[PDB]
TrEMBL record, chains A, B, C, D:
Enzyme's top EC category: lyase
Binding residues annotated for pyruvate, in chain numbering: T44, V203
GO molecular function annotations of the record: 4-hydroxy-tetrahydrodipicolinate synthase activity
Name of the protein in its database record: 4-hydroxy-tetrahydrodipicolinate synthase
Swiss-Prot/TrEMBL site (Part of a proton relay during catalysis) positions: T43, Y106
Organism per entry: Methylacidiphilum fumariolicum (strain SolV)
Family per record: Belongs to the DapA family.
Compartment(s): Cytoplasm
Keyword terms of this UniProt record: Amino-acid biosynthesis, Cytoplasm, Diaminopimelate biosynthesis, Lyase, Lysine biosynthesis, Schiff base
Any one Gene Ontology cellular component term annotated for this protein: cytosol
Enzyme Commission identifier(s): 4.3.3.7
UniProt pathway annotation: Amino-acid biosynthesis; L-lysine biosynthesis via DAP pathway; (S)-tetrahydrodipicolinate from L-aspartate: step 3/4
Length: 300, 300, 300, 300
């Protein structure tokens, strides 16, 4: 099933266009560092500001670069059911392993609306489907009872990126759902507490920067080394916090740009960090590289 | 001069397409019932599930039906700045009075991001612009100081649909902004308290059903008749409540469909009301008409 | 019926004890400036840090000084039903006009618990009772249905200080309760919007400093002058805001001490303002006095 | 240090008095089932509705019964600093191992106020002190920087019962404070995730009913057996959830009464469960016992 560490990749831009050299190198750095899979064109990838063909083209490059070496679950959700079906269908044609479907944002559908929304997309594809609950961005929550009904009637709904900020929600999901069902953390700071109560991995932002250390955190816990896992969690925790110092993906793309790895190009309405937050992030980036160097036996 | 009652109209559907005949009828019913203007293709018009071409077409039809008899502020916002600019220009070409720009939803831009987003659209158009603050659907709020800078640096930002659920926010806006800035209620149930501290009208959902009473509520306060306005507020209040019994526009479109004015056609992810909520809506509708019949001198 | 402006007075302290001269001066200033009544030893009076006998003495001193010239509703609430009964009976023996009963804080009773709590206190006394809903401090809200049941069964429950921060609560309360039931603002900044949907007065903090203008604000609205009322509201609004810059009563007691009217003696766990908030309060105080002088025809 | 499972005990009442034989039975059952210590007269013990005599007497009886076999940390907090000092000093003379200090409730002191409040109580006793953060009941949060300042200046402040409902707060606490500082879960459902990021125990409600399974949950994680701890967590999670179905201690005391172990004598304002919630608890209780049987090798 679906377990481990998945990277929600940024969409690297150069001169107003997709920077393909940047994507290749970033994808290679992930594959080389024990990452289980990639989520292209989600929130971290600035999907709202991609054109439709850029959305499709970003999934196409990712598939071509990765060449089946690790898994790809493309972000293909929408707050239009028809649009999510069309985006999901186009991803299946490219040749992905599955899709990640954020719950409809902004129009706040009822739970029965969510049931028919996700069932209509699930029925439209043979692809495995990960649901994605993030009330803070969407204005609506996928209730546990809705997830359970969805999985009862839709065999290809296999898991959930749970980003509700609530570890209690994970326990509720494990109580209500089969256990082949994969609960993944959607928040780097909460992965270890989610794993402790039955999640099996993470859709990560921080692994854009530190793929082997983030990936080691999950492996350490899953093989029964909770104290070494906690050690790595404490090492990365200040980074986990400052990667949301302003709205993701501005910190993580700024951080990659401070490394030689991408242009600091954002599409409006995202804007660069305010100067004091830029300095905090810069400092946390550096302490993080120091702290990791001292605990290298945990992750290298 | 932005003052009075503006109706956020439903988008009437028939057999999967825009129902032009129903749209004609709804618009004439508004014009004949003392409505100051129309807001096509906002939330109430199910903008997320319209195709781009449908979005422009609904705006074209509204303008063609209305012929300048009342004002039109078209919904042209997006969580992509480039997309909002393009929608706004298409509206300018159709020939509207102005544009209403919801804050970017889902990607949660920083305040500076919101400043640049709205500033770029304003600089792109000659139309007057109403900002639209609704964090429960967007996941972000337009801070008072951000509204203040927007108006300082963009002469065509002339008002706001304030739907943050907070009347105190209105007192802050009036304190921070020039008296000429027009604050409109975005929540029918808060219209009267917003007016009491300096708002000048409403972008209304309830006016879809009861245009004359909602419009009279605002006029009564503006003509210095607070106790009669309160009488009307209190007459309509249970209806205002039940138009949110599930996510707008499901109640209001269901109510119109029960009146024979449109098909009860909703695009997924919106779904019909739960049966117990349908019953509440039905009885509240009839109860409201019964009560309006008794206070006819206030609104008729 | 209970209407108009009631001042939740500070408990003036001097050298660790009740300051009787300061209390007398403050009470006389209230009586001279069109205040309808006094609420001694509520939150603004630091009820948590008074001894029982200090609690009894402040209520007795207030009754003795006022000598029935204006009304007294004494704060006698507790999160212990028995202690609230005892406090209420003591106030009745002193001879007040009524009592203000905050909902239980900290132990978070169910709605049925609230109904039994308030019903038991109401049954123990012939005094009129004002309920006091303030969820931000108590951790619980008095539901509208609970207020309605309490009034059905306890004829001496005559109103509520509504401090839930929600004007919509006022509309629900007026829907559910008879006209003789009095809803009072518990938040100076929301008094005017509360009035517009059916409140009939305020239990005020600001009136400690500016009794005539605050009481004029309420009278202006109740006599059908909504725009003079709004004008006074906007004149006072920044003061209303800064009297909550930190938890009441620190700002209002700090303001009165700056006027030489009481000692800035606070009992722990309350502490003086942070210096930046002190400066903001000081500057807002000065501006308010001059602005009030320029609209003196509205309140003098 | 302070590590493991401490039981926040109910206060067994009978006919308006302390049920001392029931207290003996409850205490012996804790000691016999691998419980590390007792927290008498906190929220679970209905401290708000105990007289002062009962508050002190319950701590004396607990101390006399326990005879130093396990630890006692008495609840001695108050929203009056002077009152907290007095309760804390009566516990010191009785001879407890420490005290638990809830933050002031209802009067919402500033952070600086919290600093002086807890520092003043810490200075008044040589006893170890656990802070107790529960904003949902108090209306105020003990900020991380405030905890950090308190510990810098008060050597006897040795840990915190963290009941803010945020696992992230634990990670922040570990980042900011010395490892010797003991963070204890204050929420049974969050104990395991708290432990995974560095908490070292629990102040538990559920251990009133299942002392050995709850204490085994903590021990298993602490001795590096995360998957067995997770098994026990999922066995108990529905009980953890339903012990908060209404405000603690109504569920736990109802459960104990149904087991014939104490009279369900609640002092108003606490009220018995709504009948549908009593039904949920009853079934969860039976299911919990059934499930505990199958993982008995984990906790027996």
């Amino acid at each position: 099933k679906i377990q481990g560490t998945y990277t929600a990749i940024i969409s690297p831009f150069h001169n107003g266009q997709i920077d393909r050299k940047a994507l290749e190198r970033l994808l290679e750095h992930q594959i080389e560092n024990r990452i289980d899979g990639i989520v292209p064109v989600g929130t971290t990838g600035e999907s709202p500001t991609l054109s439709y063909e850029e959305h499709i083209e970003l999934v196409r490059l990712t598939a071509e670069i990765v060449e089946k070496r690790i898994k790809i679950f493309a972000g293909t959700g929408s707050n239009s059911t028809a649009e999510a079906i069309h985006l999901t269908k186009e991803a299946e044609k490219i040749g992905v392993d599955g899709v990640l479907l954020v719950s409809p944002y902004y129009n706040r559908p009822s739970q029965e609306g969510l049931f028919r929304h996700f069932s209509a997309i699930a029925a439209s594809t043979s692809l495995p489907i990960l649901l994605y609950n993030i009330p803070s961005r969407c204005g609506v929550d996928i209730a546990v009872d809705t997830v359970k009904r969805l999985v009862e009637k839709n065999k290809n709904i296999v898991g959930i990126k749970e980003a509700g900020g609530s570890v209690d929600r994970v326990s509720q999901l494990v109580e209500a759902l089969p256990g082949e069902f994969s609960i993944l953390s959607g928040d780097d700071a909460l992965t270890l507490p989610f794993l402790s109560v039955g999640a099996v991995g993470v859709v990560s932002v921080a692994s854009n920067l530190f793929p082997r250390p983030v990936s080691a955190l999950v492996r350490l816990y899953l093989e029964g080394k909770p104290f070494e896992a906690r050690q790595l969690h404490q090492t990365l925790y200040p980074l986990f916090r400052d990667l949301m110092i302003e709205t993701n993906p501005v910190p993580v793309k700024t951080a990659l740009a401070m490394e030689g790895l991408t242009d600091l190009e954002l599409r409006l309405p995202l804007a660069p960090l305010q100067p004091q937050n830029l300095e905090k992030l810069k400092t946390t980036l550096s302490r993080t590289k120091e702290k990791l160097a001292k605990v290298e036996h945990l992750w290298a």
